[PDB]
Amino acid sequence: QKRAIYPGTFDPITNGHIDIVTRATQMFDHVILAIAASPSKKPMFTLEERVALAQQATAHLGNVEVVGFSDLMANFARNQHATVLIRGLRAVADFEYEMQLAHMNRHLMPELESVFLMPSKEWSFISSSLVKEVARHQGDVTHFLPENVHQALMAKLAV
Template sequence: MKNKAIYPGTFDPVTNGHADLIERAALLFDHVVVGVASSPSKKPRFDLAARVKMLTLITSHLDNVSVQGFSGLLVDFAKECDAKVLIRGLRAVSDFEYEFQLANMNRRLYPELESVFLTPAEENSFISSTLVKEVSLHGGDVSEFVHPVVKSALEKS
């Protein structure tokens, strides 16, 4: 595919903000690969298979989106997928400095990979996986921040 993008992340848990960015990317690109990073150093609440399964269910209505787990360098995964565009989300100005450094490192490692930044809808701009996990761990209602599949998984874990 000539217009293939990767949207990578740990997605632990996947939030409505993530889903929003995936849908936006699906409108812009012929195919979007949602790359679920194993990220053992982040000690995810859900294992890789569970995160891939949740994202597959959440994106099942999008014909041009696929979900794959990966480990190792993102640039190696991008090459493996033959993707030339990397989608990254920016919620706030504070995200920009880190994302800018990451984009430059990725460009150095894989010059053909271009970073494209998308912003979520305003109602999702404050949602982060970290905040959702914290609210859930303390028994709070996360139903307005995550898909019902994710809410159910959080309640069971």
Template sequence: MPTAIFPGTFDPITNGHVELITRAAPLFQRLIIGVAASPSKKTLFSLEERVLLAAEAIKHLPNVEAIGYTNLMAEFASQQGATMLVRGVRTTYDFEYERQLAEMNRHLKADLDTIFLMPSPETGFISSSIVREVALHKGEVSGLVPKHVEQQLLKKVNSK
């Protein structure tokens, strides 16, 4: 069974991410949650915080670990011995964007394939950016993120 990476910024990790990770975990010997530094994005949480939040969210999955990275995904995949990427797609817009990324990653690393998973209807509407926006406006985020993430998110937005 191959090693796969579920890459993302995870700012923060959501219940939608956790659902997809939980479904993907049995498909691979090892599944890495690749937490991207994403220097072009203004993240709410630091890379280190995002890795810790992700690690806590997936600790119930023995073959899954969270690792931060600062280089290209294809380079990170080579370093980790991964030949598969796992991506969630909620909409046709997501698919078009993800298809372009998959083609670029395969261009950079010929043996790197991408599989797409669709979220359940219960989590398909959740995105990190929407969760951040709701939290910044003092809206209810319980049920959208794991409990430990909710606590850290509220602490972070209340300190702003």
């Protein structure tokens, strides 16, 4: 069984993230979608909310397991028996941070291979930050989010 971890903040999980995790399940036997607590990022949704949103948004994928973590991601990968670490690669500015993170993860866990997947052109220009910014200004974001996530984001912004 090949086990992969897909770590991130997922605040909230978007269609771009669903695209990446779907591609990951077609390649690896079991995919752990790992949601980092990320308090330094001051996330809009609590970790508990982000885990529930991602569980509902990925329920149609049989080999996905959603978990939350506050640990060092290399230790969390070791502890999940993962040998692959998935990250989505969108644009140039993303790539620079991704290489730093992957070279650091390789220093911490050399047998964990970081692999990058490319999203559909459809989701190549969106991010959780951009979708939240549009939603804060009451713009329509239905196209970019799973149904349950769109509902939660609308509810969150209605106080």
